[PDB]
Assembly symmetry: C5
Homo-oligomer: 307 residues x 5
Amino acid sequence: PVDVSVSIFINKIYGVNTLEQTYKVDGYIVAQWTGKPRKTPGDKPLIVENTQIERWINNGLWVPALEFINVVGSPDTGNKRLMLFPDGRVIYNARFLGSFSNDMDFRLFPFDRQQFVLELEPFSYNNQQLRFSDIQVYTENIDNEEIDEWWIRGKASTHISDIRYDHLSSVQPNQNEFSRITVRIDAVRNPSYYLWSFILPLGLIIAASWSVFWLESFSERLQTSFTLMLTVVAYAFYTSNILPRLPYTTVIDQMIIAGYGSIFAAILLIIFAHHRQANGVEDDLLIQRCRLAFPLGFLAIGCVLVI
Amino acid sequence: PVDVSVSIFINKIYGVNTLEQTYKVDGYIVAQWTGKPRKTPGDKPLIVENTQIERWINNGLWVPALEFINVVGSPDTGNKRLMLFPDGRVIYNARFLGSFSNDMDFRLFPFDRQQFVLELEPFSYNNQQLRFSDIQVYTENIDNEEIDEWWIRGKASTHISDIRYDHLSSVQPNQNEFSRITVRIDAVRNPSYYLWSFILPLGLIIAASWSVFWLESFSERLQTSFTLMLTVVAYAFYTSNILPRLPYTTVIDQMIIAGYGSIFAAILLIIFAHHRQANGVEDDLLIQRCRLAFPLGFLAIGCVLVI
Amino acid sequence: PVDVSVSIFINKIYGVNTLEQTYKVDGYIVAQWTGKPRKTPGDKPLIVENTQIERWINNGLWVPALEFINVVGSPDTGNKRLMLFPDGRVIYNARFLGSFSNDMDFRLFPFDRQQFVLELEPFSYNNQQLRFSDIQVYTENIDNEEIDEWWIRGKASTHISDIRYDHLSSVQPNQNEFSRITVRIDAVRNPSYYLWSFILPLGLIIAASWSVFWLESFSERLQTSFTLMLTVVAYAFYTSNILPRLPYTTVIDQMIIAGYGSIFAAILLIIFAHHRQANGVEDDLLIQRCRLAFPLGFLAIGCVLVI
Amino acid sequence: PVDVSVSIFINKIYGVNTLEQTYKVDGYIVAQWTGKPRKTPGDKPLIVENTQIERWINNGLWVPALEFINVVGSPDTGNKRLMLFPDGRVIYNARFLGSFSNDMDFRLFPFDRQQFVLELEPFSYNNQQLRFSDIQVYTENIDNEEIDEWWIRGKASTHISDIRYDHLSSVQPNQNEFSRITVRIDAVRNPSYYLWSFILPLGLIIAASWSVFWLESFSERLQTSFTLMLTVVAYAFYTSNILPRLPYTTVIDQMIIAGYGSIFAAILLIIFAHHRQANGVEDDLLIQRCRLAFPLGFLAIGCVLVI
Amino acid sequence: PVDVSVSIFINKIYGVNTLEQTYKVDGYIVAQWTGKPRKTPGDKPLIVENTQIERWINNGLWVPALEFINVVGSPDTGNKRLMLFPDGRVIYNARFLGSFSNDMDFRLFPFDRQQFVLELEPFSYNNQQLRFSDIQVYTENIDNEEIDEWWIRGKASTHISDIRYDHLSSVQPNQNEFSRITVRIDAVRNPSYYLWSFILPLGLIIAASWSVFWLESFSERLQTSFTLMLTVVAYAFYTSNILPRLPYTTVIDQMIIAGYGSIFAAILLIIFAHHRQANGVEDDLLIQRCRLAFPLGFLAIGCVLVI
């Protein structure tokens, strides 16, 4: 089994899609393995550029075809080169630009924390023909930087494992385990834009929804509740183009639900305090004292939403 | 007729478009067939990588060109390899990433159930020159998982059939039937986002539309109905970017129609109860008792919409 | 002149853009022509796959380069093959997936009827070197089916013509007429979505705009007219992302104009009935009897819009 | 210097983007130049198709590489051919489909007039090695036609010039002037859609904004002004997706500014006529006579905007 | 070390994305270096076009592979050529069209100033095998021009540096420093569109929000505040599609926050002046004199936002 020594240089991370859970990684990759000695012009190494590599593969040079597992679409390679040494070791350098994917959990959406993963694997050689001896990742350009609204925290984590495929078992009996290199990069979301853009106006709308009971006329109370309903609908659209259709509920979706519930409970209590009459002569003040109750109750609901 | 033994490994399913009825499938495909024996260096098999395959096809190796029938655009192949054995059998492995299409029925749209189909076929060899002997599908990565808002239920279904083309009948008389492999994967839509995002606010808007008759002044009644009309129009736009232009009506479109009908019937009954006078002196209470009738009637309409 | 016999199999039609007047057609194309006899291994035909065709064109095989005239961007060919016979006839089969365009007339937009056109032509051989003898179109998959909101009606129409180019006249004097194959497929738009989505709410808004004159207070009348103006503006945006910027007026644009005119005429008549005073003491009822006139007049306008 | 005789056939113009100032041109291009005589099979010309051209360029045939200067992205060539004559002249025909750009001036935006420009140039040969002798443009398909909302007026204008590059001056001293072919096609915008879609409702909104002073109650006057402000904001969004972010002001942006100024001046005059009191007892009619003044003044502003 | 002399001609800059912080640069690049003498047909130089370059690289010609470092996706090369001299010097000319990226600071967003950067680097040769001797940039087409809403100010700045990579240190010990060419182009944003489109209506909305206290009835005061809240929400959406999700706050986002705070403070003071009673009989004028205070206070807040 040939011992390949991979080394990855993450040049930049960008294009982080939350609706699609993809991200674009641009970088270089250097593989290195020892073969048999050869005769090079002079005694220096020999550099072979892009379209001259297959002229060497045709004459019997063994270059493995590494691939990225978690990629979305075939990656965009740029330049590539071989470096052949008279000592015998071959070095394959190549520039990649790929669109990768990972499982993201958005249950704390503005105050989020995910990781960007790169999974590299030989396409056709098992660990009985090719194994990765080590892996070195050089995130110098993204070490502690604010790429988008994403804080990259610390040094990347590397791992080498063996993955078994139940397909190819009829092709290679018991020699169907492949080496795999995994690179993980932790990232923390910067929640500031969602604070001054989504949390503050929705909180003020819920406060102004509590502030309906300080009116008098039944008609103004209902029309006020309906204008506030229209504002909540506008903010319900405006939060839909930042986050996918998740089965659970985030903070902002819970605030939209809280605004809807505030308006509906205010309408219900207003209609009830208008209809709770003897015949038509009664006026209610035992139930219009929720100027302090509804802030207390909905503060308790927000607190139990925090826990 | 050469007996080809295909084996498909679905790596991931993503990008499920409802507006376009497409979905992206990424995976591998392994074909395998026996030919004539050969001389391989040593006695092991011989692995031939991407650009070295056509150097073998030029020297007379028979590799068939399988294709995907239901694809949208030419698929994106990545790496590929041949494995030639001294026994005589050839194995062709290739990675595909395609954008497939299928006929979807959205008549129960949030509570939906579709299937993802892969149709594979030889491009140029009929069943008198090439037939598929078996098909094995390995959906281990998507066996019971929540890819998007889509539950993949159970193991995939495979089938092998013979399709006849009336074109090529002037080219090949009666030898114009092709083998075809079909793979079906059942998927169930997770309706939670449409519950807490579309059903609940539209239901509350219809309830608040019933709640107009508890006012008095004709003017406040009509202006209230018009603000509710504006809210229904906002939710009519907001449901248009989740679902295509279907000739039938889903649950959410029926709720939009129900909100429009609620507002229109309230306006009509309000104007009628304002104009049903002797000359100008009458006031009506025999028709303002629909505080209980309109919930009953529109509940009956919703119930008959359920059945 | 070589007599080429083309045969087209329309596999599917999709992606019909109304804003761009394009549509995507996926299918196969089979050309066939007789040459000189040859020696084939055995006595069967000989099938030549994708990258092996140019190895035969280099050795002097005459394969013409047909093209699609009305395409938008270079088409996406997939697989292709030659079938060479010892009798002498060559058959060229190829799979195409193209984005075609056609002149559409949207003057009856929801109740529309267009046709999808495919124009095929030799790129470099006039009708003195290559002519199309016949054309057969096999629309079995789209014979009477609802692809989108588009009904495909009946069998396709084929035609063979000769087109003259005034460029290349300095290149080929009087031998500059090319054969051309035209395929037309009639399609009828399914108007249901535009009925229950655009016609019904706009009609109800125009009815509710007529229903303003049943109020009293000048202020409520004007504020009601302005809320209805806001609703008409919302529906004016909501109809703009279904149809391009046409110089003429469709049904839905005429309904938007009718809603604007209804609101403006109501505002004008309301202000006039408020100002038509002696000094400040008069009230008008000779002009507030348009509760029946405005439905009659605007019904007459809608009727003359029908004719 | 070889005298090349270019001839361009504009097949269609489409995809005219105003936000990006690009347009897609699809057509053919025929270059023609005389070389040295040769031996052709028979005595006719010899047609060489797409992938057989480089087999002739490898054996020493001189084909120049013309390019399009003002293109956005590398153009999409389709088929191409050579026509070699025993007389000695070579003709190079090729189909192009490109996305070109030009400087557009939108200062009269609905009543606009631009031109579509094609700039062709040799990539590597100066006017001392290659010069264009003439240029013929055949716009028969777009001679007087309504492609989109764009009238193509008359025959195209052609020009041949010499462009000097200060780069390549260290490469070629004083032989760094290149021939250039320019084609200009005048186009006039059809303003009808912007008339019945943007000018008419904004004018009616400004008229209804003048119509606020015919009310009484200070509160209804301010709430009416605010509903009209909301309608102007809706039309301010609705005009933003038709035109880029220009530093100057078009007609529709000036109408939006006029609506804002109408609402603001009405609010200011209403508040002033409410506060211009003795202590709290005065009512003003010397300033509420702007029912005729504000149409006159804002008509004067619109007139001076015309000039 | 070979001394390469690069020369860049910026043909155009366009496609400036603020949401993605990319920009498209189209231009040419000329490298030049001296080698060993050769025999050219005649005594002139020898021009080698696109697909004939690799026929010379196969026979042992040394052409380096320069690359662009800060590019997003692999660049789009068009034509390219070699110019070989009998003196010995080789000139490599190529046309590039790339989508580059740079770190932009939007803290003064309408009154902005950024720079467009091009970073070029050899892919495989260190400064011990290849170094850049000089760099000349010819921005004649964009010298002082208004490409979009971006003023290009003056001549470009060039720099040549040496970059060290800690990856490839196990590959090349201490010979792992690469030459790098950097080109910077200063650009100033034209703030006019944001002045007459975003600053003026938001300022008028804040003024009209101050103008609420000149009313009387508690109900009209609250409904007026809520209509103004709805207008602020509309302008809060309308400013979101011009600028990314930045952690800091620009001028327009601060104006949106100021409008929200104006409405909330007005609602709070109105409710307080309605509830600051003895029991129910008091009316407050000591706190309704903020007709002059709120302009003063919020003018002070805007002034401290300026500093």
